[PDB]
Design a protein around this ligand. Structure first.
Ligand SMILES: CCCCCCCCCCCCCCCCCC(=O)OC[C@H](COP(=O)([O-])OCC[N+](C)(C)C)OC(=O)CCCCCCCCCCCCCCCCC
Ligand SMILES: CCCCCCCCCCCCCCCCCC(=O)OC[C@H](COP(=O)([O-])OCC[N+](C)(C)C)OC(=O)CCCCCCCCCCCCCCCCC
Ligand SMILES: CCCCCCCCCCCCCCCCCC(=O)OC[C@H](COP(=O)(O)OCCN)OC(=O)CCCCCCCCCCCCCCCCC
Ligand SMILES: NC(=O)C1=CN([C@@H]2O[C@H](COP(=O)(O)OP(=O)(O)OC[C@H]3O[C@@H](n4cnc5c(N)ncnc54)[C@H](OP(=O)(O)O)[C@@H]3O)[C@@H](O)[C@H]2O)C=CC1
Ligand SMILES: *P(=O)(O)OCC(C)(C)[C@H](O)C(=O)NCCC(=O)NCCSC(=O)CCCCCCCCCCCCC
Ligand code: SF4
Lengths: 133, 115, 337, 49, 82, 182
């Protein structure tokens, strides 16, 4: 940041937010809200910003992780689409089999994925039947 | 050109069987002369007698060769293995991979699964 | 030894032998495996394709064990002794349970009686509860319920508790152990071990830890070892003075010790252990063991009963003490005096 | 007592206090390969003496 | 050096070698192959053992010449090291 | 009969204790031992120095974390050449059998606390060269591994995500409260 920008952004957002942003982003950013994840994450845009900085996320959780971003918004934050998931029709195809809840990266927890064989064994042994003598 | 390294030996063919005879003795001598020096380079905890025993057995497996062109491939491999060892290019794991520290009967092999 | 192992509960195990990709068919649980002995039993079981549950306390100190086995082979479970559920969750898929949990010195939450008696009680009661085939508990040498040293007494009572609950217990009594990261040879080459109550003249039959991990592996395969009691000791008897002589000959350093009278040192040792957080080697009972002498209790199986012949500590001094030779004498060959 | 004499003391106690912390509150687990010379990962001839 | 000194140590070494047929056959004029029953590789080990004991280096040209105890004694006197 | 006189009576009363993941500060001593753990882990996180060691093309994406777009120094991450001044080893490349002694030697020479990040399919499980005669099928046959990053190559951001996993693991690592349990 530079003095003209930082004071201009500080004037807009207020001192309390300025110190919150110095705690997570470490920057002083101002922009307009574009939408909210199913996880509470907040997304802003400002085309009057340096390249690749015009879109950013305010992470909902304190222990913020990049894998907390919902799939459609993961494309918007990545400049892979320009239309935000608010205005994007593919977020309207009803899929009853889709995760209703937020399914993040589960590693380092007890919810970590455990792999397994999905197939039965290939050879079946005889169950012995000792006929009476 | 680039310099050949410290123990680099030019690859030459054995003139006759007398030539091969003298080279094989020279190679066996040079190996067993170096066994004390191998032990402290590679921190071998066995005594040098075991190291020289293994050198003898490696030479003994090619004992019954009556072909000049097979001996010279063999004299090549020992020259490179000697040069490789003395310049300390290989490490302790390689030298210990060389020391091993099959069923002896059909019935022993049968009972444990094949071997 | 064969391609078929049949267990006490009678289940068969059709094995494919070699390598970490093969099928050892055994599901083991090794309590106390993050210590010194525990890696050698875990490496032996894991590198032959056996599933090993490793109950752990501190996460970062268990990490060297995963390298021993293939993917999915070494399973870490986080447990506490006073967490019975985590004990029961750890032994219930198993056909063998190794109990290697011990501590030389008391701690602010575990006395020697609490870690030996009660810890064995929970572990053995879960072995009984889920009907695990084999239970190899590791006690100490000189273990005796009538002993007065807290170490030799409490590990002697856990021996009887285990048999009373699970009679098929293979009880294993090793002598003081030497090896890599051993608290025998590395302390005599260290500089902190300066205090001492006797003149380092207590005797014992030191045993290679590598040959003890091998012995524990063979007890799993020799089913007839169940319900037995094994003393696993070395080929010679030495004093602490004879061992320390070998160490000096190897490191070329000539270590020295400060001797103290036991009525004086023992009270201090009980203060250092109570005021420092790390293993100091000094405690009231460790001084008491310092004045005691090893006795090989007869009617107890030996290495020969596993068909094994232990090697002498002298043959191993160069391998394990070389990191402690000064630069001037480092390039020298093994002492072999 | 003079500023110079105390200055020498304080710099030495700082050299001690920093050193003492590391000598006490850091793990110490010395083994053979950890205690070898650095030679970019391969052991070579010891010829610095 | 002394001739008897540079011979006494050879007998102890040669008798100390594991698989000579019999320790009595070692004389001042005994042959490794014909008498002491040592093949090519055993003889090369014997010159190697002799050089280590006397703390001298025996070159390839004269190492081959030592097929008998007397030849070892003459070379040891000829080379000025002990 | 019972082994020791108190058996079958003391068994009724026992202290079932929660596991380390199941605990929270309750007294002043737990509060102070957490605070030391906080200040210890915050330092390990804030001064995160990986060895400047890299085997092949994954190192290209690794050195792109040191360049202006991601500026790995803005988080306190500076690559130290010596293993004696390194906290973390990132295995960014294929581990051949000729290199495995050298990877293991410099890992042993790295002081505690130490961590290993496996970056890439080759260091994970051998990758595209898994069926080769000269390739270690995953660096975790050689050294223990704390976090695995997928991709060949993982993007510069994917590696940053794995470093953020490792720091999140440091931040939940119980050091001084671990001793207080033993
Ligand atoms: C400040 C007070 C420091 C002294 C407190 C007493 C020690 C209590 C814990 C002892 C056990 C530690 C342990 O096991 O750790 C394992 C490890 C090392 O244990 P180790 O046993 O592996 O160490 C081996 C070395 N010897 C043998 C010498 C012991 O410790 C650590 O990694 C960190 C220890 C704690 C350090 C915390 C940061 C120090 C700087 C503090 C700055 C000021 C803070 C002020 C506010 C404090 C809170 C209110
Ligand atoms: C020299 C003094 C060093 C600065 C003091 C240490 C700063 C600190 O510990 O804050 C970390 C802690 C939290 O650090 P942390 O461990 O949660 O790590 C932050 C996570 N990342 C890196 C992803 C952002 O700050 C606090 O919340 C206050 C508690 C510390 C109490 C210090 C009392 C003095
Ligand atoms: C800082 C807050 C207070 C620090 C912890 C104090 C609470 C405590 O229990 O201190 C006693 C501690 C016990 O140490 P302990 O691990 O039980 O002994 C075995 C090691 N031989 O012994 C100690 O004094 C540890 C040194 C501090
Ligand atoms: N080594 C020797 O000289 C001799 C050893 N023995 C016995 O052999 C066994 C193995 O020896 P060794 O490996 O050298 O011993 P260590 O002390 O190195 O290992 C003991 C193990 O017990 C665990 N442990 C100790 N106290 C507790 C507790 N309260 N709760 C949970 N786990 C605990 C430790 O886990 P953690 O690391 O997490 O604390 C560690 O894994 C021990 O039972 C020992 O008493 C007997 C005679 C001689
Ligand atoms: P005498 O008339 O009995 O002569 C004995 C010999 C051996 C010369 C034979 O009569 C003979 O001519 N046979 C054919 C030649 C022969 O035996 N082999 C060819 C020589 S090359 C060879 O044998 C190489 C062996 C392996 C490499 C050298 C050994 C050392 C390996 C490494 C040692 C330890 C390193 C860590
Ligand atoms: S994982 Fe891919 S990019 Fe990385 S070293 Fe291997 S082949 Fe190259």
């Amino acid at each position: 940041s530079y003095p003209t920008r930082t004071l201009a952004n500080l004037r807009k957002i207020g001192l309390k937010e300025y110190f919150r942003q110095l705690l997570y982003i470490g920057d002083t950013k101002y922009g307009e809200l574009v939408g909210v994840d199913k996880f509470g994450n907040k997304f802003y845009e400002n085309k009057e910003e340096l390249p690749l900085r015009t879109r950013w996320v305010d992470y909902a959780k304190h222990d913020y992780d990049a894998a907390h971003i919902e799939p459609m918004w993961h494309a918007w934050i990545s400049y892979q689409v320009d239309t935000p998931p608010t205005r994007e029709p593919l977020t309207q195809i009803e899929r009853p089999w889709a995760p209703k809840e937020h399914v993040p990266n589960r590693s380092f927890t007890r919810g970590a994925y455990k792999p397994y064989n999905t197939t039965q064994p290939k050879i079946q042994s005889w169950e012995p039947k000792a006929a009476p003598r | 050109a680039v310099q050949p390294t410290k123990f680099a030996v030019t690859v030459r063919q054995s003139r006759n069987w007398a030539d091969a005879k003298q080279r094989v003795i020279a190679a066996y001598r040079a190996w067993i002369r170096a066994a004390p020096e191998i032990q402290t380079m590679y921190s071998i905890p066995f005594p040098v007698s075991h190291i020289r025993t293994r050198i003898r057995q490696e030479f003994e497996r090619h004992r019954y060769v009556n072909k000049l062109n097979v001996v010279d491939v063999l004299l090549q491999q020992s020259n490179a293995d000697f040069q490789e060892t003395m310049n300390f290019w290989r490490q302790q794991s390689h030298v210990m991979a060389f020391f091993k520290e099959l069923p002896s009967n059909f019935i022993t092999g049968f009972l444990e699964g094949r071997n | 030894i064969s391609d078929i192992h049949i267990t006490r509960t009678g289940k068969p195990l059709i094995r494919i032998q070699g390598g970490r990709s093969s099928l050892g068919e055994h599901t083991a649980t090794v309590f106390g495996a993050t210590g010194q002995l525990g890696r050698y039993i875990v490496n032996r079981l894991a590198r032959q394709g056996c599933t090993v549950i490793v109950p752990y306390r501190e996460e970062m100190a268990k990490r060297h064990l995963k390298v021993s086995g293939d993917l999915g082979r070494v399973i870490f479970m986080e447990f506490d002794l006073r967490n019975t559920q985590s004990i029961e969750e750890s032994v219930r898929h198993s056909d063998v349970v190794y109990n290697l949990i011990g501590r030389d010195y008391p701690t602010k939450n575990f006395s020697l009686a609490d870690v030996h008696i009660e810890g064995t009680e929970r572990i053995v009661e879960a072995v009984a509860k889920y009907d695990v085939d084999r239970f190899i508990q590791v006690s100490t040498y000189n273990a005796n319920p009538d002993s007065t040293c807290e170490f030799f007494r409490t590990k002697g009572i856990a021996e009887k508790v285990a048999r009373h609950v699970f009679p098929e217990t293979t009880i294993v009594r090793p002598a003081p152990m030497f090896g890599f990261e051993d608290r025998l040879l590395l302390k005599l080459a260290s500089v902190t071990n300066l205090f001492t109550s006797n003149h380092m003249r207590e005797k014992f039959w030191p045993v290679h830890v590598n040959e003890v991990g091998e012995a524990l592996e063979r007890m799993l395969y020799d089913d007839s070892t169940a319900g037995q009691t094994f003393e696993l000791y070395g080929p010679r008897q030495y004093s602490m003075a004879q061992i320390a002589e070998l160490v000096d000959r190897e490191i070329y350093k000539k270590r020295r010790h400060i001797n103290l009278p036991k009525p004086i040192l023992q009270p201090l040792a009980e203060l250092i252990n109570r005021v420092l957080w790390w293993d100091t080697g000094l405690s009231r009972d460790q001084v008491e063991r310092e004045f005691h002498d090893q006795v090989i209790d007869p009617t107890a199986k030996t290495f020969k009963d596993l068909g094994m012949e232990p090697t002498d500590i002298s043959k191993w001094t160069y391998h394990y003490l070389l990191p402690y030779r000064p630069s001037t004498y480092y390039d020298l060959p093994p002492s072999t005096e | 007592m003079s500023a110079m004499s105390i200055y020498i003391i304080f710099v030495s106690i700082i050299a001690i206090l920093f050193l003492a912390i590391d000598l006490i509150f850091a793990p110490h687990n010395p083994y053979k390969e950890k205690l070898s010379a650095f030679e970019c990962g391969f052991h070579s001839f010891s010829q610095s003496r | 050096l002394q001739k008897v000194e540079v011979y006494e140590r050879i007998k102890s070494l040669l008798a100390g070698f594991d698989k000579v047929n019999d320790p009595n056959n070692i004389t001042e004029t005994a042959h490794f192959a014909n008498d002491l029953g040592l093949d090519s590789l055993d003889t090369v080990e014997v010159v190697m053992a002799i050089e280590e004991e006397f703390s001298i280096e025996i070159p390839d040209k004269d190492a081959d010449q030592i097929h008998s105890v007397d030849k070892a004694i003459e070379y040891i006197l000829r080379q000025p090291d002990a | 009969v019972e082994p020791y006189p108190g058996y079958e009576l003391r068994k009724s009363l026992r202290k079932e204790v929660p596991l380390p993941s199941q605990e929270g500060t309750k007294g002043l001593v737990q509060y102070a031992l957490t605070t030391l753990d906080i200040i210890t882990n915050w330092a390990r996180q804030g001064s995160f120095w990986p060895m400047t060691f890299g085997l092949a093309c994954c190192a290209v994406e690794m050195m792109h974390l040191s360049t202006p777009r991601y500026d790995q120094d803005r988080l306190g991450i500076i690559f130290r050449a010596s293993p004696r001044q390194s906290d973390v080893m990132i295995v960014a490349g294929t581990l051949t059998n000729k290199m495995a002694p050298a990877l293991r030697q410099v890992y042993d020479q790295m002081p505690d606390p130490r961590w290993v990040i496996s970056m890439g399919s080759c260091a994970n499980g051998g990758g595209y060269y898994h069926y080769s005669y000269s390739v270690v099928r995953g660096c975790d046959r050689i050294v223990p591994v704390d976090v695995y990053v997928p991709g060949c190559p993982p993007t510069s951001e994917a590696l940053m995500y794995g470093i953020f996993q490792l720091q999140r693991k440091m931040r939940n690592t119980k050091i001084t409260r671990m001793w207080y349990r033993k």
